């Protein structure tokens, strides 16, 4: 799905935002789909850790990025996961579909904040509130962006009104105040 234009643009914005501070020491990617984005991010991270509830998704994404030796993978979700070294970039571009209510949502967000380095950046993207609403995911971009703003400083956003009904989404970039 390289040459479908919408995904092309979304990946480019995600990367642009992720890149804005120069190279990342220690990055976290949350959810990894087929490894398309990990492949673009790995080269700009001194260390990259990728977390994904779905093991078979990891078997696959790992193939894709075999060439780099500074990536590691965890079969776990953002509620259950925790690190010992903070992250200067957390990317969360995947609908956290496994989040069943606002309390899971609120908790997931706290964990992300707990793992941001100082002046670390959190880049978020997802289908807006109403596409997610359409699919049983409780909430999406605007609700998450309201909660993230409580803890973090929004630096920038971009909106990706692509093609179909599904293809319309919002990305925002937050700084963790030092």
Beta-strand runs (E) in 17-166: 24-30, 45-51, 71-74, 87-92, 116-127, 153-161
Beta bridge partners of residue 22, listed in sequence order: none
Q: Which residues are annotated as a binding site for S-adenosyl-L-homocysteine?
A: 10-11, 33, 52, 77-78
Best CA proximity match to 158, nearest among 5, 1, 10: 10
Deposited resolution, Å: 2.4
Q: Which structural domain range is residue 65 located in?
A: 1-178
Closest CA to 137 of 102, 172, 92, 93: 102
Q: How was this entry determined?
A: X-ray
Nearest to 144 by CA among 76, 97, 83, 84: 97
The answer to whether 128 and 142 have CB atoms below 8 angstroms apart is yes
- Residue 76 DSSP class: S
The tokens describing 21, both together, are 């501070």
Cα gap 163→2, rounded to integer Å: 15
Q: Residue 22 maps to which CATH number?
A: 3.40.50.150
- Our count of domains for the chain comes to 1
- Which H or E element spans position 173? strand 168-175
Binding residues: 10-11, 33, 52, 77-78
DSSP state at residue 100: -
């Amino acid at each position: 799905l390289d040459d479908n234009p919408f995904e092309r643009e979304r990946h480019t914005q995600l990367l642009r935002l992720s890149l804005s501070s120069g190279a990342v020491s220690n990055g976290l990617e949350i959810g990894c789909a087929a490894g398309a984005f990990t492949e673009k991010l790995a080269p700009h991270c001194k260390r990259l850790t990728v977390i994904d509830v779905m093991p078979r998704a990891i078997g696959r994404a790992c193939q894709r990025t075999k060439r780099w030796s500074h990536i590691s993978w965890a079969a776990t979700d953002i509620l259950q996961f925790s690190t010992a070294e903070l992250f200067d970039l957390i990317v969360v571009a995947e609908v956290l579909y496994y989040l069943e209510d606002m309390t899971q949502m609120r908790t997931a967000i706290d964990n992300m904040v707990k793992m941001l380095a100082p002046g670390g950046h959190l880049v978020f993207g997802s289908a807006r509130d109403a596409t997610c609403r359409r699919w049983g995911h409780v909430a999406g971009a605007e609700t998450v962006i309201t909660i993230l703003t409580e803890a973090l400083t929004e630096v920038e956003r971009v909106q990706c009104q692509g093609q179909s009904a599904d293809e319309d989404c919002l990305l925002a970039r937050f700084r963790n105040p030092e």
